[PDB]
Enzyme design. Structure first.
Site: not given
Ligand code: NA
Length: 129
Positions: A35, A46, A48, A50, A52
């Site tokens: 990750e 992301n 979309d 969003s 992380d």
């Protein structure tokens, strides 16, 4: 902060992630490796809109507030910036909620694709724990 492999294993254990919801410590270290490469400051946008955040790349869509993810939730009740701290307490507390949400560690697509079913104990091999 960029953790060492065994340094991160020790921090995750201290915060009670080892065998949390039945996931051995190697599973958590493997997920953090793919990750974030063990970097608490890791961020990824992301498609979309969003983002992380942190060692376990926790998504603003559901889990933290970053003020720029329309229609999103903040189910861990934290600013996403808390997920970038040298102290992994916020990431660990939020990851416990994520992995309890019904799909276990499949929530982390990198864990499913790169960790699941592999020899995850190799990630804590030789660590004083
Ligand atoms: Na959010």
């Amino acid at each position: 902060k960029v953790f060492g492999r065994c340094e991160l294993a020790a921090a995750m254990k201290r915060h009670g992630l080892d065998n949390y919801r039945g996931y051995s410590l190697g599973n958590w270290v493997c997920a953090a490796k793919f990750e974030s490469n063990f970097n608490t400051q890791a961020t990824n946008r992301n498609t979309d809109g969003s983002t992380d955040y942190g060692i376990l790349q926790i998504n603003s869509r559901w889990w933290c507030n970053d003020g720029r993810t329309p229609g999103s939730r903040n189910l861990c009740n934290i600013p996403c910036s808390a997920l970038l701290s040298s102290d992994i307490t916020a990431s660990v507390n939020c990851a416990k909620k994520i992995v309890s949400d019904g799909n276990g560690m499949n929530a982390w697509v990198a864990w499913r694709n790169r960790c699941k079913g592999t020899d995850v104990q190799a990630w804590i091999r030789g660590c004083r724990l």
